[PDB]
A paper describes a structure:
Recently, C=C bonds conjugated to C=N bonds have been shown to undergo full reduction to amines through the combination of ene-reductases (EREDs) and imine reductases (IREDs),6 as well as the newly discovered ene imine reductase (EneIREDs). The key step involves a stereoselective one-pot amine oxidase/ene imine reductase cascade to convert N-substituted tetrahydropyridines to stereo-defined 3- and 3,4-substituted piperidines. Depending on the EneIRED employed (Series A or B), the kinetic selective reduction of one enantiomer of chiral iminium 3f affords the enantioenriched piperidine 3c as the final product via reduction with a second molecule NADPH (Cycle 2; step vii). Predominantly, EneIREDs in Series A yielded (R)-piperidines whilst enzymes in Series B such as EneIRED-07 yielded the (S)-product.
In order to gain insight into the mode of substrate binding in the active site, we determined the structure of EneIRED-07 from Micromonospora sp. Rc5 to a resolution of 2.55 Å in complex with NADP+ using X-ray crystallography. Crystals were obtained in the P21212 space group and featured six molecules in the asymmetric unit, representing three dimers. EneIRED-07 displays the canonical fold observed for IREDs,38,39 with two monomers associating to form two active sites between the N-terminal Rossmann domain of one subunit and the C-terminal helical bundle of its neighbor. Following building and refinement of the protein atoms, clear omit density was observed in each active site corresponding to the cofactor NADP+. The iminium intermediate (S)-3f, the preferred enantiomer for EneIRED-07 imine reduction, was modeled into the active site using Autodock Vina. The model suggests that the allyl group of (S)-3f is bound within a hydrophobic pocket formed by methionine residues M125, M183, and M214 at the rear of the active site as shown; the para-bromo-phenyl group projects toward the front of the active site bordered by L180, W184, and the NADP+ cofactor. This ligand conformation places the electrophilic carbon approximately 3.6 Å from the NADP+ pyridinium ring C4 atom, from which hydride is transferred. Modeling of the (R)-enantiomer of 3f places the allyl group at the base of the active site with less favorable interactions with hydrophilic residues Y225 and D238.
Author numbering:
A (entry chain B): 7 to 297
B (entry chain A): 8 to 297
């Protein structure tokens, strides 16, 4: 006998969340501003609620995954009555501020609130590859751990009592994803000028990525210690190599803004006295506010 | 175990030499600054009195200095002694730089391999080291076995084009900076909540590992020119990018990086990619900065 769960929001991610709960035996009530997106889910045994109220009331565990916290707040305020005493899990993407302003709203209405981040794509939801970071009501998490493991069986991980923490890790991890995707796509656009297929490039990209994890492990203690001994490569060397990517790009008639920018960053680090330091020393520039 | 010469004893130079030494090769080393050979000589390398005596000592000359301007200042005064020896240039280079050095070497009948070291010094000699060579097929085939001392698992020959090693290097370095910036800017973010980078890292690396899946899946999309959004649309990426931008501005940390990222999604969407996967960004990355 698997407990009931409600999923509010049936985007690409919403749909995957619901499906995961359904497959894991939970009686799954779904609702979306656009009901058409429940069609395939209802066929597989989900109940499409007539209203968000009837959706919220159906289950003691409400999962919401919509665009942003403006959409969350438009959705949860009209149903604050029916929410009260139910555990609301907000897996929508958010700033720390947004997560914490929603935490304070929920506490005032005695709604136990977990602020979550989905570190996975929809097809990964339900698999060992999915990592979900939750932070907020410790008791509420402890109570529903087993139900929530339907979307992240290997990595249903609770951080701290701070609701804003899930958001901070999410923001930091997404920045790494775009770092990689931009690096690989800009890299494929480079190799493209030599009629090299991205499918050919990829396995090498991924071998390099795997090896770059070593650098991350090794730069971490350097950031924490504030000591940046260059055992691998100096800012000078990084800086010079960055000139090559910038020039290579300009010259091949491809995108040059990304690498030019990267170079602007090394230039600054070196001007702040980091010439002989490892790439870990870039932490100091990344702490400094912009225009 | 054939003799090998390493010209350049920087952090990378020293590691290259050490690898050859440990692998039994009689290793002659030379550097503009001879002090950097000290530890290598103690382990059995011969410090040549001059670059000429260094080049002459072995039929295989490996050079790893700052840039191709430094290579050309070093190799031109010894073009005589080089002739008929295989010169392997593992210095970082543009495709143009690699190819202008290839044409200089051919005129002086010097067999020329242009290489890229896709590894850090401590990862030279291990299975983790990948080295990409491109140029003289015969010269590579002849010295494969000696060169496997620096990259035993991934001593990889590309094509006869000398500039190709440079293109793969440039593309792979772009990914390194992508990740390092992402992780360091990410640690600066988590830092505002007094979270240690050492704590963040294992999660960073779990996410990175999982992002490799996206790369293998976006590759065929870029090559086929079809960007079906099975994971997430440009719209969704675009919105999420707003969050990092705002979060950063607000926490008093660096905001240029994520703001820029967003500028890219905005453009992709304006070029009609709203409903396409992040693979569609290839089209923006092909377009010059104009
Ligand atoms: N791979 C991924 O896609 C991925 C990864 C992890 C995290 N996330 C996060 O998951 C969330 C949803 O992503 P997704 O793929 O489901 O996005 P999506 O496909 O764009 O879906 C957005 C969902 O939110 C609803 N919504 C949007 N604005 C609304 C409003 N003002 N009021 C009420 N409902 C509103 C939409 O309702 P309609 O159907 O009526 O438009 C839809 O159900 C985002 O915060 C995203 O950052 C996504
Ligand atoms: N180390 C890495 O992590 C790594 C990884 C892959 C590729 N690389 C490539 O390796 C090269 C340098 O690596 P590195 O880290 O060992 O560099 P480095 O520590 O900066 O050493 C640079 C080398 O170049 C020599 N040099 C510089 N200018 C010279 C000149 N005008 N005349 C003669 N020699 C000159 C230096 O000799 P002196 O000591 O006399 O100055 C030194 O041996 C770059 O092309 C870089 O892209 C580095």
């Amino acid at each position: 006998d698997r407990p009931p769960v409600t999923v509010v929001g049936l985007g690409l991610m919403g749909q995957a969340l619901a499906a995961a709960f359904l497959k894991g035996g939970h009686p799954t009530t779904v609702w979306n501003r656009s009901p058409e997106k429940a069609e395939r889910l209802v066929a597989d045994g989900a109940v499409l609620a007539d209203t968000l109220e009837s959706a919220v009331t159906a289950s003691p565990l409400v999962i919401v995954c919509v665009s942003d916290y403006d959409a969350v707040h438009e959705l949860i305020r009209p149903v604050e009555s029916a929410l009260a005493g139910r555990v609301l899990v907000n897996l929508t993407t958010a700033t720390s501020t947004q997560a914490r302003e929603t935490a304070e709203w929920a506490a005032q209405r005695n709604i136990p609130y977990l602020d979550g981040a989905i570190m996975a794509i929809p097809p990964v939801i339900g698999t060992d590859g999915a990592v979900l970071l939750y932070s907020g009501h410790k008791s509420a998490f402890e109570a529903h751990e087993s139900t929530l493991k339907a979307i992240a069986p290997a990595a249903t991980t609770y951080l701290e009592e701070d609701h804003g923490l899930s958001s901070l890790y999410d923001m930091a991890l997404l920045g790494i994803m775009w770092g990689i995707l931009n690096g690989f796509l800009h890299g494929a656009a480079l190799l493209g000028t030599a009629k090299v297929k991205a499918e050919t490039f990829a396995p090498l990209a991924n071998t390099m990525i795997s090896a770059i994890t070593e650098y991350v492990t090794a730069y971490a203690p350097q950031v924490d210690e504030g000591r940046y001994e260059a055992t691998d490569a100096t800012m000078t060397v990084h800086q010079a190599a960055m000139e090559h990517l910038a020039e290579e790009s300009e010259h091949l008639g491809i995108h040059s803004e990304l690498p030019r920018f990267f170079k602007t960053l090394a230039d600054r680090a070196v001007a702040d006295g980091h010439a002989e330091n490892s790439y870990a020393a870039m932490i100091e520039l990344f702490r400094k506010p912009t225009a």
